[PDB]
Amino acid sequence: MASRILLNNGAKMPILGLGTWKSPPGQVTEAVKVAIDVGYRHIDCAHVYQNENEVGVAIQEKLREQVVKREELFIVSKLWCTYHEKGLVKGACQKTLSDLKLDYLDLYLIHWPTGFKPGKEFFPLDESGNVVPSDTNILDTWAAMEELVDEGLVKAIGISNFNHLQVEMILNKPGLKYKPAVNQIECHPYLTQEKLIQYCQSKGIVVTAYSPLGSPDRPWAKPEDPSLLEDPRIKAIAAKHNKTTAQVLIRFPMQRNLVVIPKSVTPERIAENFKVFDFELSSQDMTTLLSYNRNWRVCALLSCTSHKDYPFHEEF
Ligand SMILES: NC(=O)C1=CN([C@@H]2O[C@H](COP(=O)(O)OP(=O)(O)OC[C@H]3O[C@@H](n4cnc5c(N)ncnc54)[C@H](OP(=O)(O)O)[C@@H]3O)[C@@H](O)[C@H]2O)C=CC1
Numbered sequence: 048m049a050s051r052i053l054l055n056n057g058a059k060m061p062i063l064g065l066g067t068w069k070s071p072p073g074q075v076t077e078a079v080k081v082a083i084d085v086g087y088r089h090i091d092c093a094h095v096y097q098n099e100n101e102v103g104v105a106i107q108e109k110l111r112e113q114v115v116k117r118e119e120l121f122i123v124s125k126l127w128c129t130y131h132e133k134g135l136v137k138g139a140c141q142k143t144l145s146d147l148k149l150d151y152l153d154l155y156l157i158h159w160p161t162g163f164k165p166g167k168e169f170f171p172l173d174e175s176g177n178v179v180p181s182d183t184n185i186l187d188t189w190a191a192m193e194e195l196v197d198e199g200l201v202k203a204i205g206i207s208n209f210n211h212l213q214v215e216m217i218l219n220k221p222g223l224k225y226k227p228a229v230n231q232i233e234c235h236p237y238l239t240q241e242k243l244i245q246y247c248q249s250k251g252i253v254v255t256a257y258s259p260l261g262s263p264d265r266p267w268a269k270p271e272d273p274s275l276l277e278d279p280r281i282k283a284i285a286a287k288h289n290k291t292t293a294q295v296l297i298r299f300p301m302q303r304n305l306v307v308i309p310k311s312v313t314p315e316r317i318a319e320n321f322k323v324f325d326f327e328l329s330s331q332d333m334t335t336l337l338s339y340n341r342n343w344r345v346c347a348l349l350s351c352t353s354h355k356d357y358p359f360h361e362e363f
């Protein structure tokens with residue numbers, strides 16, 4: 048496959064990136080170094096992951112080593128929910144830039160549509176356990192994102208975990224200056240997202256699929272939960288193609304015109320997951336994988352479900 052997709056800001060984005068949520072800080076520097084050495088050119092980051100400094104050490108070393116040029120990398124980060132404040136967005140972006148050792152990001156996302164009360168805590172709670180909202184809405188936060196483009200801090204802006212009506216709100220914003228380039232959402236065979244993906248694609252927004260392996264290391268995993276990697280129907284498709292189940296799970300979103308960001312800190316898996324450019328799933332394979340949808344989500348959070356902008360009450 049062509050390795051990059053054209054965004055609506057005119058830049059090209061690698062369709063395969065390395066995820067970094069849960070990558071331990073003592074392992075992620077090596078993971079990113081290995082990833083760049085074996086061909087990855089896109090790293091997905093976030094301030095809330097608490098490991099951007101260590102990701103940045105790797106990026107900077109590989110730039111210094113001249114393994115890659117900065118223009119060949121595509122570095123993504125995300126604005127956390129406690130920084131949806133006009134006066135906090137720039138500083139949040141600049142902290143991420145300082146940690147990652149960069150003078151611009153290729154793409155900066157609103158991590159979740161919901162703003163939370165600013166402060167030290169990433170999830171400020173009331174005494175009954177509900178998140179404490181911010182009064183600032185997705186339109187004013189979007190305007191703040193647009194300023195980052197105009198100041199040279201970021202080349203593209205986008206959104207993450209926005210539902211259909213939230214994307215529409217952004218697109219219908221009075222005075223909209225820059226459209227979102229990307230909507231990054233959970234997507235895999237058990238949460239296939241056909242409706243939201245067609246909506247976004249019809250509007251020229253590129254969709255990035257997160258948790259493509261079903262996030263087996265999520266901290267809230269339970270025994271009885273479904274397991275993509277162990278699903279014998281997916282294993283059978285993989286065997287037919289002489290590939291691993293993970294490789295099928297990565298190739299699947301690629302053939303839907305999605306970007307995909309599997310996470311690993313295991314060097315052998317980082318390499319395995321990149322070897323997805325020399326086979327094709329058939330249309331029948333694709334439709335069969337889509338048939339496994341069960342509307343199952345890795346990422347959801349009870350403490351945030353009353354926030355007025357919590358995204359998963361809407362059907363899509
Ligand atoms: N925008 C958002 O709200 C969100 C963004 N994301 C982004 O998406 C990325 C990917 O999603 P994530 O939830 O981390 O989970 P993934 O679906 O990428 O699964 C990661 C898990 O799969 C394991 N794994 C990786 N490759 C293989 C393989 N070849 N064989 C077997 N097991 C494998 C990893 O193990 P190990 O590391 O031990 O090798 C890890 O336990 C995140 O890291 C983050 O960057 C994710 C959730 C939300």
Ligand SMILES: O=C(O)COc1cc(F)ccc1C(=S)NCc1ccc(Br)cc1F
Nearest residue numbers: 068093095096097159161346347348351357
């Ligand atoms: O969020 C990630 O990228 C990966 O996940 C996380 C990553 C972190 F570093 C810290 C918390 C999360 C959680 S608990 N995320 C889920 C979540 C957060 C906020 C809202 Br609004 C809803 C929701 F479902």
